Amino acid sequence: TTALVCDNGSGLVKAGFAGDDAPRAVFPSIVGRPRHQGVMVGMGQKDSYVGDEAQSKRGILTLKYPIEHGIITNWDDMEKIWHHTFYNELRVAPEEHPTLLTEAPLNPKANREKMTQIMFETFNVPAMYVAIQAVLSLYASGRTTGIVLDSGDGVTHNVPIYEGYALPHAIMRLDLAGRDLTDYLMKILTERGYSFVTTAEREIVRDIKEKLCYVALDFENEMATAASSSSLEKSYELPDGQVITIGNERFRCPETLFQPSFIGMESAGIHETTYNSIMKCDIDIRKDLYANNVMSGGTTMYPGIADRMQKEITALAPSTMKIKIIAPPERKYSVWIGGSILASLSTFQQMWITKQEYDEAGPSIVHRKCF
Amino acid sequence: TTALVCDNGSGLVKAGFAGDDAPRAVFPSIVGRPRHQGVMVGMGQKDSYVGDEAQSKRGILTLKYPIEHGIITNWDDMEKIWHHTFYNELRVAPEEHPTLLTEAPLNPKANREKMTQIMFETFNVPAMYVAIQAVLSLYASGRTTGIVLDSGDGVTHNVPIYEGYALPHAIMRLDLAGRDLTDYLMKILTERGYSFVTTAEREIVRDIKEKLCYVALDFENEMATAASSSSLEKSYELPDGQVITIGNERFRCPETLFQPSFIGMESAGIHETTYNSIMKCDIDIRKDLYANNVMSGGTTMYPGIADRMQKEITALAPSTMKIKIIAPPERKYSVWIGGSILASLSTFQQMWITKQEYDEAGPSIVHRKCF
Amino acid sequence: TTALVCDNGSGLVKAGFAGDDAPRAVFPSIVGRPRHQGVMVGMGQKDSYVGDEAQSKRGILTLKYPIEHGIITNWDDMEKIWHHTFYNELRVAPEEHPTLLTEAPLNPKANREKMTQIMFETFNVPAMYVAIQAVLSLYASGRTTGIVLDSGDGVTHNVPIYEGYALPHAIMRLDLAGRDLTDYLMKILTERGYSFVTTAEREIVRDIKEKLCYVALDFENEMATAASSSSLEKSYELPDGQVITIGNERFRCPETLFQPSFIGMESAGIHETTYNSIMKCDIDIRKDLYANNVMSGGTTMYPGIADRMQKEITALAPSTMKIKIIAPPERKYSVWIGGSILASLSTFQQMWITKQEYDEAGPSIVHRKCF
Amino acid sequence: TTALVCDNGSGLVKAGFAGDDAPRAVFPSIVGRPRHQGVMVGMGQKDSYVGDEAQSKRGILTLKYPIEHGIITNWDDMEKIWHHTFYNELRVAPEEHPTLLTEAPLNPKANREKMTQIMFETFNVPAMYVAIQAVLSLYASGRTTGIVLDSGDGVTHNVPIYEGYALPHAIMRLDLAGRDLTDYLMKILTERGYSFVTTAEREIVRDIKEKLCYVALDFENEMATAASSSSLEKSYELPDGQVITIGNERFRCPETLFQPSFIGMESAGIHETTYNSIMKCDIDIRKDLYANNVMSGGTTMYPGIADRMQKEITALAPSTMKIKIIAPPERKYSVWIGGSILASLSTFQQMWITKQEYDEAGPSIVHRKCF
Amino acid sequence: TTALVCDNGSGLVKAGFAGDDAPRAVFPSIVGRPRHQGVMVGMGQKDSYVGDEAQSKRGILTLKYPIEHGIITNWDDMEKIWHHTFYNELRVAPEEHPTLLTEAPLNPKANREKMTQIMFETFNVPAMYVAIQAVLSLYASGRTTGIVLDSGDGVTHNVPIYEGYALPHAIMRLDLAGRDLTDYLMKILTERGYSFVTTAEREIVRDIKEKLCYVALDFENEMATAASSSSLEKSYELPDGQVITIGNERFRCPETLFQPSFIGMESAGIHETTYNSIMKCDIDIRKDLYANNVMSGGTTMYPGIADRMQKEITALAPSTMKIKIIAPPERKYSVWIGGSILASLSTFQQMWITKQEYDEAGPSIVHRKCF
Amino acid sequence: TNLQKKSFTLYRADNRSFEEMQSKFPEGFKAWTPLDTKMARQFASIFIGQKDTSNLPKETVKNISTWGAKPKLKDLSNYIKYTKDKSTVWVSTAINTEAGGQSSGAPLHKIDMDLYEFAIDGQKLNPLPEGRTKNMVPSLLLDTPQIETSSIIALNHGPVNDASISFLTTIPLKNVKPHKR
Ligand SMILES: NC(=O)c1cccnc1
Ligand SMILES: [Mg+2]
Ligand SMILES: [Mg+2]
Ligand SMILES: [Mg+2]
């Protein structure tokens, strides 16, 4: 009777049972196949590897992401991810329970049609529902009027909601994400002159990004100090025991979020978009949303980013008005946690769409449930 | 059904029955004919003598090796060895049983075609298989991962293997081998002033080389000590009862392996190539290969060789990382022993290339099966 | 002595001599400055680019419109537009002639204050007149009782006039325009899933809008037919040779003007406002305006728009009375055409305000002449 | 007064005077020191030999390149190269003239710091400029919009340029170069079975590659034909008068550039990168870059490469769009030729950075001007 | 001040002053003691007789050489030769001058240690240098790249030298010499049946060899012609007035050098070794050594030997490459002539090792200075 | 005609560091996709025969399908040695701290066991008071004098010294202690 909560993420994929408060599994959403023949008899090699296996065997292997931004390009590998997820990770059979699936706030209808068809036909689930990530994130703090900012491995997007109403005209999208920071960070490490190329090296870069890097409180004064002072520099050790040193790059990466012009992206730094989406609100609401503002997803995890957001929007000064940020801890999990709570509610027993009803209606009704 | 295992080695040839764990015969792979007429009537002399026959008649005789490095140079004399092997030592007919043959990791395609063609047409065998010598060695240590190091009577070569995949590009070959160490040993004994010339005299030296000689833990301090102290000195007695004395020379031989420049060879000392082959690997695997390292073949048998190797790679210090060496006993036999295990395995019943299939395909299919 | 005729448009700017019947130049009202450093020596790059050159260089550049709805936001760049117009486009010097300048029917006094001040101080004109587009539009057919509709890139507005007397209270303005249709068209293009973002793509959007799109006579029946049938669809190819296909969107765009609630705009659909402006007249004057009512400007270009306007106000049925629209060709040019005809007339010699009189009076005398 | 134009290349180094149209000297960038004691009295042997002298004495010697892709590892030998270049090749004193220096498009700052510091302190030059190879190549044909492909002895890299603006983000680098092709050709000739080891043989290999080898127009048909017919084979004679014959290798080598997977390199074949780099541009420019395409550097010299490049990128078919290749003669010199033309231009009198200004500023001003 | 140059030879001993171009003394390297009583009272008979004196008394005497092949066997009697040389042969006192001494290219350390010790302690010379015959021979034509062949009464050896660098590994030695030809000619003359026994007759053999004997261009055609015709035969008259005739014997001796197997020796004929030493050279230099090749010493004196050398190396055909021989007249003297020329040079003032340094260092420095 | 038991000491080096391993596992060390003890007894029984049924993860069914002929023990030993991914259904153990794996920084854990040991012709399991573990045939180890108890099934293959043992059955903390790296 416990429904199932399942997440689609350009970096990480999360699967849940109703009443859990921590995700039962999280693993890198990666599918890999072997670059070389293999030679020892009876080794029993697989066709392909997924999740942690691909990290363990990483050197011999070539790596794909089945996701782009919010697009998907390789439906069978995506299916193999789900297959591995349920059978090995959850060890629960899929027919037992209805299923819940998540999408970024603006994505082309064909993806949801594919997911619907596949979920009913392959896994014989009783019923299926599709849900919009900003709302589930908002449930993490439940405020009945909310403005939401999300930035994940592949998308940054905005939705203001008031009294439970979103405003379609206010929907704003920016495709700046961790992938861009990783490419930029490869170019800045090229400044010192270490080699990094091919996906295996790309994952080591991602680890360094997550451990060492941090936001500047002012780019210009901090970098001027760093030009004089060693104290900023940090040193780090590769799996090969080769050792690395970092300077201006440590702050220089997050600065991208505040100035896309560093990467030639053009849609303004994230605060400027946030302010513009508020500007598309009615003249009354603006104050009410400056008062409280909500942030989610792995890119936000960095230390101090809210402080710079606050100072920048204060300097933008939409008015002489108080400014605040809601940046709760453990933020990355929150989208799943919220999905679990809302999945618990009684009304979803209204919302679960049966296979029989899907056959009666066809797919289009499944889109019709919302935007 | 009991396969038969037969080996080609620039110095010694070993013969086995599948499922044995020790070879029934070992003999020098040498072909010999008498240097003088012979005079007693009816003595019933053969045309030629091969293997063990050559030691008894050694003074009267002239000697060829049919093997050079990784090449066969004299197909009719080479053929004479195989002929002698089955009938006299094993006394088994070739059609009865399948046969197993071994090759160095990189050799021009023409050698395998002749070996293949001769085995079917001359010996009418039911089946024949060809296998790559570095790989079989790993079976005798039986670990999932390990860099293989081989140095035999005629070739030195490297192959890293990880989790059952070889990496064709990291394979390295060096033409430094027991023959050159023996030629070098002739010149240092020339310092004392004994005459040694022609192959028969050349082989007597090899016994001294195999018995007395040993590796120095430091070349410079040991040689300075040996100049002062007699205790290193050793004295030795020939089959003619003439007696021989040795000083600094006892260590000077192994030093060749670490500094080819003493002999004017240039391709670096074996650790430096070994280090280079790991460095030519991907940045992840490097840690895992320091973890396990495998040595094989008669040249490795010398005392203390492993100790000097460790200090060299430690001195290269690819990192502050643990380094270890696996130098198991019976190292010389290990290359044959692995062949016995592999012949037993079930899966080979797929791999055996039939005479009928070879007649259908022709030769070209036999190389394509591997490198 | 030949005066000069000048037009202000958020998209296009038109410059004229009295007695032409087609404007000598029209170009997109756009100003651009370079986004990138530049590297080639001697390239002699400008500070900035304007009009068609900016369309030619569109990719390298970031783009502004200096006018909004009826407001100027960057007086020096606006001046640079005029500067380019007089010297390059017209090749006539401005001091030579009196000048005619245009404002939308309700805009804050400061715009006329600036145009007056700048035109006198910078261009040293002999005398000046300022003229209001609704009246000039009405002159296109000279009918003595009229209500008029124009809609351009930034504003849509209506004016009834009777027998040469304006009704100050009946003038109505609505800021719903092609820019908003452009935003709607971008969101519907996201429905199919093509990416379109940033100004360079935005101009392609405007072109696609002008060619492909057309009006539905009823939205519900049209959409029910289009959901079934491909036959409506048309396919079109970008400057990149990438290719695009369009469906329901083709009718779906124009319909927005009649139901602003689709975009979260709130002010009622435009026909209802036109009728509302009619309602404060007497039932006879109302009658005479229902019998004939005149429409102009690029929004009118759509196919079938007269049919939908007629049927919508007919269903509104202010009475059982005939209603008609006069939408003659070259309709877009008509505001200028009227300006030229009226510029020819004798009476204008009264209307020209001399520079000397402006210096004596200041601007307010220039305001006093009208609204 | 005649400034100087000087080139750094992993294979060849070129030195020029402004207004020349052919480089006055070009020689292999090689430094060598003796492997043996030397024995003849009074022979007056040098420490080292450089360029052609090192080629003449090639057999006795062991050889280094002081360059790695785009990196210097041995500053004193590189300095010895420059010393020989100025005094011997040009026979002009260095203080006389300002100086022009070249770098691959992305290399660690330390190279420009050393070149600046050393050139000022050792050669006491009046003024200096540093220049980026893609731009100088483009000047060779002067087209104001160009996309450029270069592959030299040590690096392959791409730069799109439009109307004189570079786009720093679209720049792509690939570390596949002639050195790797030479290693691959050594392994395949070992496949046939000729011996090749040690650097002296390596230069003979490079010669053989330059003469015999050519690109295949289709790999599969060519190799299937070569398997049948002897007629493809060609024979060539070494300095030793030993003679060599080549078969499949002739096409099999260049194929590496289109399939790095043959050598285990992974970053895709160069056409796929070129296409990706255009795709990473804005949607307008793409047509214009398919419109014009420019090739430079020794790797392009191969016969037929333009035809295969054209058909492969056409086969990607970003659209039904025209595709073109600019393969002008004297392509190798073009990187120098452009430097000479640009050195002639008047504007450089601004660009020359004086030694005095460098002492005032320190190094950072010389870097700040660009990457 | 004129130093002295002195040579040690199993057959001939040569003593020289710098600047001579012909040796001041040459005498048979022979020491003799009486085999019989002697009868006249007071005759004051010596212990021993040497050189021509020993030839004069040859009949009464039994004969020793104090050297073999390289090796001294009787240091006190050898000293007696030197003592006789200094006082009697040159009539100059030995202490007067520094001294130059010659050794075959590979001989046991004890010879140089004893010669150094004895010459310094007994004759108290001021300074000393020791020199290696291949090098001195090369000076005879001064060519900077050379391969050298010497064959004397007790040793035959080869050295390639290029541009003043020795190649320690390519040095090859063969102990096949004129004494062995003397034994061979003694056995075939015993076949015909003349008596030849005891050293005096051996000296007669040496004389007969020098006058009568000559080289065959092919042994088989020579033997077929000589078997038919007497005309080959030549006749010679002994000191006993006995008279001698020679047939096949005339050619059969020199032919032995091309086929040692005639005497049952195995180490190949000397040309075959020279060729082997070339093949043991680096692959580049080999052409240049075919380009220049140098022959010296009494075995070369034979008529026609260069032609047979040419045909042998051509038939080996290392390539279709030019081969040449330098066979200058007065070849026998050349090793001394070169020693005198090199002795004149200024730089030698470095090379002379003083007696004082010998006392400080001990002997080992004298070996250490070179091979 | 005898019962005797012999006792063996074993090391594991594992990223489940002892304090965490013992915290998360109440149940000690286990395979990724473990069989039932009942199924593992069936699997071990297949080497005798009675192979007419399969109930276990299909990948292993493919492996046993490969080994159609009787002497399954060799191919089983090889397959368990080289296969290494999550699919594996066993745990593998090293006697000498020389483990062919991370073997560094990994802590080491020490386990003690008492067992009966067997060498197999293909149809019987036969007493080995002398252990015969130098000859490079495999060896098979059982908790009890017959297959039924199936509480541990473990086999030993390799050289005498560099020997390795692998288990189709849970190794609980009850057996296991922290040990000296
Ligand atoms: N972690 C270990 O001790 C180990 C032993 C044998 C095989 N695999 C792992
Ligand atoms: Mg308008
Ligand atoms: Mg170059
Ligand atoms: Mg001599």
Author numbering:
A (entry chain B), B (entry chain D), C (entry chain A), D (entry chain C), E (entry chain E): 5 to 375
F (entry chain F): 102 to 282
Would you copy out the relevant sentences from the publication that reported this structure?
Tc toxins deliver toxic enzymes into host cells by a unique injection mechanism. One of these enzymes is the actin ADP-ribosyltransferase TccC3, whose activity leads to the clustering of the cellular cytoskeleton and ultimately cell death. Here, we show that TccC3 HVR modifies only actin filaments (F-actin) and not monomeric actin (G-actin) as previously proposed. We present the structures of the TccC3 HVR enzyme in the apo-state, in complex with F-actin, as well as the structure of ADP-ribosylated F-actin, thereby providing three structural snapshots of TcHVR activity.
We chose to mutate E265 to serine, since an equivalent mutation in iota toxin (E380S) was shown to inhibit enzymatic activity. Indeed, enzymatic activity was drastically reduced and complex formation with F-actin was significantly enhanced for this variant. Using this variant, we then performed single-particle cryo-EM analyses and obtained a 3D reconstruction of the complex at an average resolution of 3.8 Å that allowed us to build an atomic model of the involved proteins. The TcART binds with two helices of the three-helix-bundle (α2-α4) like the skids of a helicopter to a surface formed by two consecutive actin subunits. In addition, loops extending from the β-sheet roll interact with the upper actin subunit. These interfaces, that are mostly stabilized by electrostatic interactions and salt bridges, lock the position of the enzyme on the filament and place the catalytic site of the ART close to T148 of actin. A key residue of TcART within the F-actin interface is Y183, which wedges into a hydrophobic pocket constituted by two adjacent actin subunits. Interestingly, we observed two additional densities in the nucleotide-binding pocket of TcART: one of elongated shape starting from T148 of actin and continuing to the middle of the toxin, and the other one, of spherical shape, in proximity of A114 of the ART. We attributed these densities to ADP-ribose and nicotinamide, respectively. The nicotinamide is kept in place by hydrogen bonds with the backbone of A114. Our structure of TcART-F-actin demonstrates that the engineered mutation E265S stabilizes the enzyme in the post-reaction state, in which F-actin is ADP-ribosylated.
